Amino acid sequence: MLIPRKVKHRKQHHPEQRGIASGGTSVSFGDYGIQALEHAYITNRQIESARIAINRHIKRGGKVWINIFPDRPLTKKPAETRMGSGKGSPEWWVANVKPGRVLFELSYPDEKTARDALTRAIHKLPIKARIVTREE
Amino acid sequence: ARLVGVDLPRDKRMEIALTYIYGIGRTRSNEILAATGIDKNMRTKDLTDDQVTVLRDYIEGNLKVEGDLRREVQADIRRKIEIGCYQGLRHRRGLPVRGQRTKTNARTRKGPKRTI
Amino acid sequence: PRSLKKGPFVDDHLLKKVDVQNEKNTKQVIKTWSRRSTIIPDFIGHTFAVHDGRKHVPVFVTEAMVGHKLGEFAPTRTFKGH
Amino acid sequence: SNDDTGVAVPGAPGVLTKLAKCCTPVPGDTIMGFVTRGGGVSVHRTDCTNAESLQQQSERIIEVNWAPSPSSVFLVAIQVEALDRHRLLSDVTRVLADEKVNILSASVTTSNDRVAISRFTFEMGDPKHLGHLLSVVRNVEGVYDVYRVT
Amino acid sequence: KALPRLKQRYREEIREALQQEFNYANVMQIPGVVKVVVNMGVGDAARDAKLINGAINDLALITGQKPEVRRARKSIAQFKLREGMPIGARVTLRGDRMWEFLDRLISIALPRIRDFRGLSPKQFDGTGNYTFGLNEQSMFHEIDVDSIDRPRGMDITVVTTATNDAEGRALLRALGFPFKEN
Amino acid sequence: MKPGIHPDYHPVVFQDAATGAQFLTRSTATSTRTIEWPTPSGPKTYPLIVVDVTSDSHPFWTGSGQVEKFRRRYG
RNA sequence: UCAAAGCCGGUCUCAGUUCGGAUCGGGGUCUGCAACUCGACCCCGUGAAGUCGGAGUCGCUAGUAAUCGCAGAUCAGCAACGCU
């Protein structure tokens, strides 16, 4: 699971789920990629499960990139507690994923297995997504 | 350490004062002072300058002294022995090269003590 | 040691082994058992395998070791520590 | 030490030949020997890595031929994958059930290129018996990298 | 008039020799000795600042100037150092005192240090400004040797108008510095 | 540098003993700390201080195994 | 024609010293086929620790202890400062 070494502010406001992505809208790293079509907080678990799904659907051969790091904390109040008494402690680490943002990238020889691996990853992911290509 | 012909090596007789040099002992001092015309029963406070000059040039012409001699010693050890001769191995490991009991008393080379 | 009037001591075996190596200009290793035979300014390049107590011990002679007895290059005992 | 590896010296018998951990020169390839200053004859190969620094010491060397057939081998390893999720990491044991092996160059890393890199040791130092074990060890279906380690 | 020996020698022959060795388009591009600085960094004064006065006396009796006591810029836990304390005695030397001290140094002190196998010519900052160092003070005849209780070395730097180590080395060797050939 | 701050200087005479080399320079060794030995030099008179070795006298670079050993040993 | 300590004189003047002599570098001699491991001795140079020794402990009642040197055996040579 990805996680930052440190953050200047451990307790942060929720990232604004609005706007189309202005950066990371393209590939720039590989041949095939996952593009997002919804807003969502993508977490460590989601990222690692999708990476793993790719790395299992296809094995030694090709490369994978993760163009998002979940450096945005999300807190959780304890359970069975009242509202108030302060803000919760960080529990989840997410990355605010606006539409257009390319999340995962890979370079693999056969388009079939590459696209299928990316499909496995998307099914691990909480959002509607899309296969994209470096070419166009 | 500062001077070969230390103008005051130490205030005392010459035969014993010249031994305050890394290549001079009692007999070299005696033969030096005999080759020159300097008494040995005289202190260094009673020196002159010409005495020091004849001593310096005699020494620099005849025999070796602190820096050149010490470099000769260390170069002898390293180079002329080698990396891996016997006396060199034992110099390296800090032990008596010339044949000695290492079992009990080689402390002058081994150090004070490392009791386990 | 080894009074100059008596000259250096070199076992005749190693001598007849090395003089032919000189005069034929070949320098294959010499399997000489005796160590003790003072290195003389005749074979800087040739290699000897002197100590046969328990090991081969090759030794390539150089300029730097002439006169030294060949067994100095062939430690018999072994100590690594406790 | 002097029982199996070393009996090829032209000059005279008796050997203190040791096979330095440079290139595994035990296969019968173009090799030579450097009289290890304090430690015998380090036997090295022509395509060795630290061969130029030894040839810089050009006096302390001697001819060697080295075809002593009845002896042992230095050994060599290969790059082969694992998978790390409940299958195809125990394939290493499945394919080691048909071969015994000592550890040479193992390393586990999975936040990497697209595999749980598990570079695989081996006990195979034969010229004409390499592709055989490289087929026996190639069950994972994603066998792209197959070359040995030097 | 009464110029220093080294200085009249400089502007009589050394300038022309440097011109020949490096044909300078302009005379004002000729190398010249700007200053010499004698630092006597005594970091052992932090624990007790009584050694600084001996450093001061030594540098004064050597050069001819009261030194500047260099207060520490920074506090260092490892060196047992606070800010502001007397670590180092610096003397800047320009002009006639500079030339006189250089002549004294060259002609007296450097042959007076034990086992003087020369000074390194590589010891240039990269701008024709030399800097070497000493381990003691008795090499200067100006000090009474009996009054030397503690050895106290120094760092002597000779900064010039030269723009490279080559011209600096030429100038220094022309002045008569002992540059061993390496 | 100022008048009192600095030590005293005066042109003194560096005399070498090995060569008789003869320099004149201002030094902190002066009427305060010269060897009490004046001489005339030029149109004035200066005190001396003496030197054991100088740039002219000193043997430095301005003015200055073993098969051979074993062969003069063993012929 | 055997001593040494001793006696006389000179010098050193309380210091890690002209104490101490180890260790180490070089150059030698002698033995012996042969002194690397591994000899003794000599010369030049070096000049370590050691400032009278914690707990504790040993020998000795007179020609004794303490100190001084000498000889012998073994032995080519010596590691003998041991032993008699």
Swiss-Prot record, chain A:
The question of whether RNA-binding is a record keyword is answered with yes
Q: Which is a Gene Ontology cellular component entry for this protein?
A: cytosolic large ribosomal subunit
Q: Which SUPFAM superfamilies match?
A: Ribosomal protein L16p/L10e
Q: Where is the composition biased (Basic residues)?
A: 1-13
Pfam families xref list:
Ribosomal_L16
Entry keywords, A to Z: Ribonucleoprotein, Ribosomal protein, RNA-binding, rRNA-binding, tRNA-binding
Any one biological process term the GO annotation gives = translation
Q: Where is this region: Disordered?
A: 1-24
Gene Ontology MF terms: rRNA binding; structural constituent of ribosome; tRNA binding
TM annotation in the entry: none
Superkingdom, taxonomy of origin: Bacteria
What family is this?
Belongs to the universal ribosomal protein uL16 family.
Q: What is the protein's quaternary organization?
A: Part of the 50S ribosomal subunit.
What is its biological role? Binds 23S rRNA and is also seen to make contacts with the A and possibly P site tRNAs.
Task: State the protein's name.
Answer: Large ribosomal subunit protein uL16
Tell me the organism: Mycolicibacterium smegmatis (strain ATCC 700084 / mc(2)155)
Lineage summary = Bacteria, Bacillati, Actinomycetota, Actinomycetes, Mycobacteriales
Gene that specifies this protein = rplP
UniProtKB/Swiss-Prot annotation, chain B:
- According to the UniProt record, where is the region Disordered? 94-116
Q: What does this protein do?
A: Located at the top of the head of the 30S subunit, it contacts several helices of the 16S rRNA. In the 70S ribosome it contacts the 23S rRNA (bridge B1a) and protein L5 of the 50S subunit (bridge B1b), connecting the 2 subunits; these bridges are implicated in subunit movement. Contacts the tRNAs in the A and P-sites.
A cellular component term (GO) from this record?
Answer: small ribosomal subunit
Q: Could you describe the subunit structure of this protein?
A: Part of the 30S ribosomal subunit. Forms a loose heterodimer with protein S19. Forms two bridges to the 50S subunit in the 70S ribosome.
Its family? Belongs to the universal ribosomal protein uS13 family.
For biological process, the GO terms are: translation
Protein name per Swiss-Prot or TrEMBL: Small ribosomal subunit protein uS13
KW Ribosomal protein (keyword) present: yes
Q: Which residues form a coiled coil?
A: none
Instruction: Give the UniProt keywords, A-Z.
Output: Ribonucleoprotein, Ribosomal protein, RNA-binding, rRNA-binding, tRNA-binding
Task: Give the residue spans that cross the bilayer.
Answer: none
Stored PROSITE patterns: RIBOSOMAL_S13_1, RIBOSOMAL_S13_2
Q: Which Pfam families does the protein's record reference?
A: Ribosomal_S13 (PF00416)
Report whether Repeat shows up as a keyword of the record.
Answer: no
Instruction: List the Gene Ontology MF annotations in alphabetical order.
Output: rRNA binding; structural constituent of ribosome; tRNA binding
- InterPro entries, alphabetized: Rbsml_uS13_C (IPR027437), Ribosomal_uS13 (IPR001892), Ribosomal_uS13-like_H2TH (IPR010979), Ribosomal_uS13_bac-type (IPR019980), Ribosomal_uS13_CS (IPR018269)
Signal peptide span per the entry? none
Top-level lineage group: Bacteria
Swiss-Prot record, chain C:
Q: What is the lineage of its organism?
A: Bacteria, Bacillati, Actinomycetota, Actinomycetes, Mycobacteriales
Q: Which Pfam families match?
A: Ribosomal_S19
Gene3D superfamilies associated with the record: 30s Ribosomal Protein S19, Chain A
Q: Name one GO biological process term.
A: ribosomal small subunit assembly
| Keyword field | Ribonucleoprotein, Ribosomal protein, RNA-binding, rRNA-binding
The similarity annotation says: Belongs to the universal ribosomal protein uS19 family.
GO MF annotations in UniProt: rRNA binding; structural constituent of ribosome
Q: Which GO cellular component does the record give, naming just one? A: small ribosomal subunit
Protein name (database record):
Small ribosomal subunit protein uS19
Gene name as annotated: rpsS
- HAMAP family, sorted: Ribosomal_uS19
User: In its keyword annotation, does this UniProt entry include Magnesium?
Assistant: no
Please give the function described in this protein's UniProt entry: Protein S19 forms a complex with S13 that binds strongly to the 16S ribosomal RNA.
Swiss-Prot record, chain E:
Q: Please describe the quaternary structure of this protein.
A: Part of the 50S ribosomal subunit; part of the 5S rRNA/L5/L18/L25 subcomplex. Contacts the 5S rRNA and the P site tRNA. Forms a bridge to the 30S subunit in the 70S ribosome.
One Gene Ontology MF term: structural constituent of ribosome
Q: Which Pfam families match?
A: Ribosomal_L5, Ribosomal_L5_C
Q: What does this protein do?
A: This is one of the proteins that bind and probably mediate the attachment of the 5S RNA into the large ribosomal subunit, where it forms part of the central protuberance. In the 70S ribosome it contacts protein S13 of the 30S subunit (bridge B1b), connecting the 2 subunits; this bridge is implicated in subunit movement. Contacts the P site tRNA; the 5S rRNA and some of its associated proteins might help stabilize positioning of ribosome-bound tRNAs.
Name under which the protein is recorded: Large ribosomal subunit protein uL5
PANTHER family for this protein? 60S RIBOSOMAL PROTEIN L11-RELATED
Q: Does the keyword ATP-binding apply?
A: no
| BP term (GO), one | translation
**Domain of life, per the record?**
Bacteria
Q: Which key words tag this protein in UniProt?
A: Ribonucleoprotein, Ribosomal protein, RNA-binding, rRNA-binding, tRNA-binding
* InterPro entries found in the cross-reference section: Ribosomal_uL5, Ribosomal_uL5_bac-type, Ribosomal_uL5_C, Ribosomal_uL5_dom_sf, Ribosomal_uL5_N
Family in the record: Belongs to the universal ribosomal protein uL5 family.
Per the record, what is one GO cellular component? Answer: ribonucleoprotein complex
